[PDB]
Amino acid sequence: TGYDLSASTFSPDGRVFQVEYAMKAVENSSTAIGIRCKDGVVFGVEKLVLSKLYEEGSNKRLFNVDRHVGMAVAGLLADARSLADIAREEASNFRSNFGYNIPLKHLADRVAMYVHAYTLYSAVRPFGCSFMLGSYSVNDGAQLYMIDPSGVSYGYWGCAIGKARQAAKTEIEKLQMKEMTCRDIVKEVAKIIYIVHDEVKDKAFELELSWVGELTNGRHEIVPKDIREEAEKYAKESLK
Amino acid sequence: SYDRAITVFSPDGHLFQVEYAQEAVKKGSTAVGVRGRDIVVLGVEKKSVAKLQDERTVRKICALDDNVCMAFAGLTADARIVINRARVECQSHRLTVEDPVTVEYITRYIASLKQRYTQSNGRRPFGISALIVGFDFDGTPRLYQTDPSGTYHAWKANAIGRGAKSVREFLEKNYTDEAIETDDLTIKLVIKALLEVVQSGGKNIELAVMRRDQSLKILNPEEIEKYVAEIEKEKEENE
Amino acid sequence: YDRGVNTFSPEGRLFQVEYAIEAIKLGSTAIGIQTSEGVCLAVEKRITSPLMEPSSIEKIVEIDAHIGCAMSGLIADAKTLIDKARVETQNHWFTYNETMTVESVTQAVSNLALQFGEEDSRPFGVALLFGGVDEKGPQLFHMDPSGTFVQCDARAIGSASEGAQSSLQEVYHKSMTLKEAIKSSLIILKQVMEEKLNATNIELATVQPGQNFHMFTKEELEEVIKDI
Amino acid sequence: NQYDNDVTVWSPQGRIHQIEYAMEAVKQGSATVGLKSKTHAVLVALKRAQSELAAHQKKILHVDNHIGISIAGLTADARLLCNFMRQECLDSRFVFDRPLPVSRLVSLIGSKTQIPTQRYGRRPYGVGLLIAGYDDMGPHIFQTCPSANYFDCRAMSIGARSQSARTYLERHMSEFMECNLNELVKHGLRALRETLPAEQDLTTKNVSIGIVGKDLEFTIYDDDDVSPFLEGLEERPQ
Amino acid sequence: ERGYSFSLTTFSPSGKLVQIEYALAAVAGGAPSVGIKAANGVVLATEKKQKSILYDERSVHKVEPITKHIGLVYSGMGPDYRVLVHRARKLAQQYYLVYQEPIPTAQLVQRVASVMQEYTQSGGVRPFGVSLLICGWNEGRPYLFQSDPSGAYFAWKATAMGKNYVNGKTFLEKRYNEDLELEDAIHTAILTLKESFEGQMTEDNIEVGICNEAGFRRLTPTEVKDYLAAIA
Amino acid sequence: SSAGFDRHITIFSPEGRLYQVEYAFKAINQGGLTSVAVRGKDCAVIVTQKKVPDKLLDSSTVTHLFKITENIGCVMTGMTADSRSQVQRARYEAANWKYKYGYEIPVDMLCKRIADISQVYTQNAEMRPLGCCMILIGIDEEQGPQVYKCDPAGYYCGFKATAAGVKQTESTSFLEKKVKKKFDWTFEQTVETAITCLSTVLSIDFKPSEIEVGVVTVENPKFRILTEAEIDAHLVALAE
Amino acid sequence: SRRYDSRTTIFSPEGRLYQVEYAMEAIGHAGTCLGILANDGVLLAAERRNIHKLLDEVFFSEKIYKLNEDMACSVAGITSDANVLTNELRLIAQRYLLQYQEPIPCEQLVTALCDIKQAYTQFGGKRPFGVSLLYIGWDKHYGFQLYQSDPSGNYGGWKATCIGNNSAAAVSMLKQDYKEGEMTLKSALALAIKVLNKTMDVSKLSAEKVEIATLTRENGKTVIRVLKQKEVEQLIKKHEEEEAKAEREK
Amino acid sequence: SIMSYNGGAVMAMKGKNCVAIAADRRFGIQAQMVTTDFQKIFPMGDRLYIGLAGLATDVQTVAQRLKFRLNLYELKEGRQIKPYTLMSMVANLLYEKRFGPYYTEPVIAGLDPKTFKPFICSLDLIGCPMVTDDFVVSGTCAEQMYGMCESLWEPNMDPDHLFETISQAMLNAVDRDAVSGMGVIVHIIEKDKITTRTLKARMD
């Protein structure tokens, strides 16, 4: 061995294991899915109740970067909200210098280069987080990007990060997100995260949803309570 | 900027780089010093002459001021930069407080320079020990020494270098009150002490006396030949 | 093979902070006792050679007129912490025109005690006792290489620490007097040291509410020895 | 093990061990319990000593008039964050002239402690802060950890032998959002008698209680004024 | 970020700087190159084989000018060469902005070799893997110098670097004398590169630059075919 | 063959080799991807494939063709996170040429500045030397079209036909037999001889949705990316 | 990053330090230089190493470097490390002259360089210099002087010293043939060719294999003269004429 | 002004195969002499001199920084400096203090070492070099020295008549100046020897 201690050494077949070891820390965080509808993006995070002592609304795995940009994370939570600070700080310098709201193809480009810069040196480690970015503009439509711990970003019509990643995006392509508005989506986001994580491994869990589009007038915010109670009314009909 | 902890603790509480440096002292040449009530006398042994070199460039007794002499052992490369930093400090004292430097003050400068240097980043400790000898104001002759860890420490008689345990065990059975009776009688203690060390039969010894008002005065190898005659002559008749 | 200087144990403590706790078991023993009449505070010298001058070494040194100290473990790096404590009491006098209390001296040193690293290099291998009389009466504190300080009533620090701490819990009570607390400590030092006790192996220093920091010398000290 | 030397090095499983070893440091300190009502936030600590003549090591500290903390771990790192904690409260009071909100304070702590968990030759902060305070939204109980992951909670307990204290809080947390300050405290005092050996409990010299209150500035009670709170508790059933 | 700030080139217990010894092995595995001065100018010649027919041979150049009158070839690895060319381009300019005079060829080798010594002692770097051959005609008399990755330099009449350099130096010893013209030195420099080349030596397999009192220049492939004609 | 830490950092082996660079050439091959560039008489064509495995992924964000300047385009092989960071340098270095010197940068001077940056990574013993390759095309006056490759060792050369990736050696054996029969090359012939290069090496016989073609020509020197409709025009004319 | 560090500065558990002793092991091989003085004048005799038949033999010397207007040095060891030390103490002598408007004494030029050389052995995490070197010169305080430096950083005055490959063979013969203050600068030249006749294994003493430079005091000149290759070989055979007579008559 | 704080005058003149340089001897502060042996002409190798005039500090300061850079040049290279090369060296030295300038104006005179050809030039206080073929002057009494040299210089002059011309040019122009005088020293160099003479001037 010895070829996998630093992030500055290639393997004798040419790959960095410190990045691949940090990717393995993502599959212990639970599940964060997000699909974009015809006219908006809907996030969704299923949230483990570790003990009864915590408070409903603690330690949110679903951030708010700019007025229109949203973030849902999966990984090591201290590194997640550290990336959420620089992305929130990067969007401020765009507006203060260029005058208008930052677009997503540039915003996910600036963050991913900051993530990539920690996979070159022995002095730092790679981040242990993967996350998603989604927004809506009236001149651009909806956008949905995703960033791995290596620093690779792409666009998606729907993606998933967590433990059961393939078991979640199996059912995403059963949907038809090209035509659905972001009202029927909210019932379908919650349904596909109910069929995952059987009650053997986890006792109880918590739904946490997010929501952006022109129905939210471009601003990013959480769903109201009554709409996600309809999705939890749409919970126990997957047993047929 | 080389930032690395050189001196670290051991799992039983020692500083290995400090006590490795104390063995570099333990194979430098022997330096002996006693003090009389009016004239101090210190003198190195093991000059180890090769009769083709300049005799003044090899000296190990130097002066920091008019009143303060200094001898050392260990490796000579680190020695003469501690001296040159001590000459600056004892000179800048005169720009401050007007009296000349007391002999106790300059050892606290050397020992505190030597300690914090076993504390910094990327610096091996010094590998020298010293003997600082001076007769201060109000004519009080006294001496000190400096461990490489930086513990200044006064004495009545001392000896460092290669073969220092045997000489110190020799002085405790030999340092009486009447051994410092006369000025020429205290010198007969030192020449008897260094002869009880690595051989130095009048050809490898270099004493240097100071009579509390002069500077240092190296006697040439004629009185040392005169003193080693009478030091053996008293031993010739008693036994 | 080589860790850093900044590495946790699998048991969780550290390595070189715990190693420095081992280093203060090699120093000379020291005893301080807090009494409502005042703080007495003693040490041995551990004289090595007959040719050595005895008064050149010291363990008791003063910080201010009303605060004394006592050191153990290594000595050469104790002189750094003493000098930081002296400057700290003068900056407090300069700006506030009063005397810094005994507790707030100690945390000013204890914040310095754990600051090694690889920026801006090892912990300090000393252990200190702080005797003083502030406005809350006489006080006695004890810091650590780890930077932990706590008020004690009768603390024994050195190579003979746990042997003295057992014999010190049986003689102390809350209503001592200073004349007998001095006599009680020299009985403990007489048991634990190597050589016989005289007026040169040890030294004492007391601080009272009335007078300032006073250190005994070789004339008023041996009356307690002959009347032990 | 070669994966167990520096904070930078990932494990082949994906678990940095130097963070996990700092979790052992908070399990060595003595226990403390925090909990809240609708209008109050109470944290109760359990002091330790070394000998019977040395004093007990205090744990509850005063940060601001509406924020107090409780420590568990090595105390020198605790004062390094506490001096950061005081500084960030009074400059916001210097600039905006308002008390800094509690939930926004802890996000500064999580950013402060995450930085040495990613550089080279930098240890994590081994400390166990329980935070109790007031926003405009009432009481808050927060905990942190050396992994820089802070948790919002309504009752927690950290330190040595703290799992028995959590089992007491789960079967009594239906009552916490109703009671006044009197039996809110001696609910929390019944948690500390759970985390002790079966002979000594609460002898008025090893316990400290702090309350921040809806009309009450944050106040620390020590070893004489504890005695009104500490009386009125039943004997340990055995 | 920051650097390492420690030398990774230390003394062996046998007293040999091992990384400099290994860097000379990379020099010996390079392309062969010969250089001959003869009484009015210096001839530098190298050996340039593309790996396939797809490469454009008129794109990069081995023989490089430094100023009006100083040329420079190498035998080592590729990308390390282009670094200390650009360094040597600049060092000739700070000499000229002070003294208003073209730099002597001896003073250029003083300053290029002082880079490589400074680069084999400082922290966190491996030494270069090239040797150099530097020509020029300053004050009538021509010059021919050779540096190494250690930082030393020499003054040769004729030498060879690269593969089979121990066979090239024996060949030059039986051929070179003190009295040759420039065009006679060209014919004996192609004759010594023919000792180790492939089967066909065309006008683009080699690259020759010359110095005169008229200054340094590099031969176009037209007359290189003329010198390659009537050879051997 | 090995002594010291020469397997781990960029120092010399006893044989004169150094392994961390030649470990990084076969980090290019882990993409599973191959690109071909062919220079013509008055044009230059880059062709490369794209592999879209999911229907949930947006097919418009997986382009390996990048527009460096208005007249210079490039294709990237190797790993994705290092390739996109290197494009960010080339966009930056070209803008400083225009600001300092007042005219459009030549394509060989741009490739020299990239290789000098990549040289430093294999020169200091701290950094990791960016395991991805680089191929540029462009029109230069009094030179016609010209193609350059930069590898992560710092080497570069001008080519006439170029392959890079997994099937590099099989494609260059194809192209050197194609060029040495010395046929003249029009616009449509260079497009035909570049598609049929990797269509016979990979043996796919694809449809217009898997490849993407960038081009430059001396009648419109803008770097432009071909539409799938006009790729299909070349593709059905290839099957006579 | 701390795994790749070699720790060129720490001690060894036996007390000494390894890194300069390996450099003083490399100073044993690769070169031979010697000096001698007893009267007006001082000489440096150096032995050339590269004696290949294709070299230009320029730059006025090979191992002799004129430092000041009235002193020079001979060097041994790593030649690339030698060039950096030479043009380092060359401007120490000039910044002395800029400051005091007086030529530098020969002794405190050596102490200035040997403090720079000592610092690399002491901190910085740096390879030391594998260079030892001689010093000849003149000053008004002591006249003709002769010094020797070491890679450890300690110097010394001398009367005759060699740092060759068989330096210990030469020093044992120098203290068998000498006279304190009476060897004028012809007997010293005669004694120099006798010593390097022995320590050079290549016999017969080819006149191009050695270099000799002298420093004689002319009233305001202090002439440093590298004597040419036309008067070496007559001094070679002058040793060869007497040795046939001294052997046969004994 | 600043240049008139101490006075001074330096003249160089080109001959056939020779070149002469002359300067005054007075050192003083605005009205008051101090000494009459102040050196203003400094040697820079054989057969190559430099004269400095202006503020008496920068006369002694620049002549020591220039000697500092010259000895490093002649030891790094194996040869003496050409007269043209020193002109570029001084012009570098003055231009570095572009905004902190030295208040002096150098005059360089010497023979080219290989082909023994004379060379004269002069520089302003920020280093604009001006080479001529007849004469250059610098100092406070400049305009008096132009009336001498424009009327007395001849193209091809042996070193005897070159000495007589530069002597009569200095003894009359400096006599008309108030803050310059108290003696004149004249160096006349050539390829075989070098000659220093001091003139009998008015000590008035």
Curated annotation (Swiss-Prot), chain A:
Induction: Down-regulated by antioxidants BO-653 and probucol. Up-regulated by bacterial lipopolysaccharides (LPS) and TNF. One of its GO terms (biological process) is proteasome-mediated ubiquitin-dependent protein catabolic process. It is found in: Cytoplasm; Nucleus. The modification Phosphoserine is found at residue 238. Pfam families: Proteasome, Proteasome_A_N. The 26S proteasome consists of a 20S proteasome core and two 19S regulatory subunits. The 20S proteasome core is a barrel-shaped complex made of 28 subunits that are arranged in four stacked rings. The two outer rings are each formed by seven alpha subunits, and the two inner rings are formed by seven beta subunits. The proteolytic activity is exerted by three beta-subunits PSMB5, PSMB6 and PSMB7. Interacts with AURKB. Interacts with CDKN1A. Interacts with MDM2 and RB1. Interacts with the C-terminus of TBXA2R isoform 2. Interacts with DNAJB2. This is Proteasome subunit alpha type-3. It comes from Homo sapiens (Human). The lineage of its organism: Eukaryota, Metazoa, Chordata, Craniata, Vertebrata. The gene is PSMA3.
From Swiss-Prot, chain C:
GO terms for biological process: proteasome-mediated ubiquitin-dependent protein catabolic process. SMART domains: Proteasome_A_N. It comes from Homo sapiens. Induction: Up-regulated in colon cancer cell lines. Up-regulated in fetal Down syndrome (DS) brain (at protein level). May be the target of the transcriptional activator NFE2L2. SUPFAM superfamilies: N-terminal nucleophile aminohydrolases (Ntn hydrolases). This is Proteasome subunit alpha type-5. Expressed in fetal brain (at protein level). Glycans are attached at residue 185. It comes from the Eukaryota. The keyword Acetylation applies.
UniProtKB/Swiss-Prot annotation, chain E:
It is found in: Cytoplasm; Nucleus. The modification N6-acetyllysine is found at residues 68, 169. Changing residue 108 to V: In a colorectal cancer sample; somatic mutation. Transmembrane segments: none annotated. Coiled coil: none annotated. PROSITE patterns: PROTEASOME_ALPHA_1, PROTEASOME_ALPHA_2. The modification Phosphotyrosine is found at residues 4, 22, 74, 119. One of its GO terms (biological process) is proteasome-mediated ubiquitin-dependent protein catabolic process. SMART domains: Proteasome_A_N. The modification Phosphoserine is found at residues 5, 12, 14. Keywords: Acetylation, Cytoplasm, Nucleus, Phosphoprotein, Proteasome. Induction: Down-regulated by antioxidants BO-653 and probucol. Down-regulated in response to enterovirus 71 (EV71) infection (at protein level). Phosphorylated on tyrosine residues; which may be important for nuclear import. The keyword Cytoplasm applies. One of its GO terms (cellular component) is extracellular exosome. Belongs to the peptidase T1A family. Component of the 20S core proteasome complex involved in the proteolytic degradation of most intracellular proteins. This complex plays numerous essential roles within the cell by associating with different regulatory particles. Associated with two 19S regulatory particles, forms the 26S proteasome and thus participates in the ATP-dependent degradation of ubiquitinated proteins. This is Proteasome subunit alpha type-2. It comes from Homo sapiens.
Swiss-Prot record, chain F:
The 26S proteasome consists of a 20S proteasome core and two 19S regulatory subunits. The 20S proteasome core is a barrel-shaped complex made of 28 subunits that are arranged in four stacked rings. The two outer rings are each formed by seven alpha subunits, and the two inner rings are formed by seven beta subunits. The proteolytic activity is exerted by three beta-subunits PSMB5, PSMB6 and PSMB7. Interacts with ALKBH4. Belongs to the peptidase T1A family. It comes from Homo sapiens (Human). The modification Phosphotyrosine is found at residue 155. One of its GO terms (cellular component) is nucleus. It is found in: Cytoplasm; Nucleus. Component of the 20S core proteasome complex involved in the proteolytic degradation of most intracellular proteins. This complex plays numerous essential roles within the cell by associating with different regulatory particles. Associated with two 19S regulatory particles, forms the 26S proteasome and thus participates in the ATP-dependent degradation of ubiquitinated proteins. The modification N6-acetyllysine is found at residues 98, 100. GO terms for biological process: positive regulation of canonical NF-kappaB signal transduction; proteasome-mediated ubiquitin-dependent protein catabolic process; proteolysis involved in protein catabolic process; regulation of inflammatory response. This is Proteasome subunit alpha type-6. Transmembrane segments: none annotated. Keywords: Acetylation, Cytoplasm, Glycoprotein, Nucleus, Phosphoprotein, Proteasome. One of its GO terms (molecular function) is endopeptidase activity. Glycans are attached at residue 1. The keyword Transmembrane does not apply.
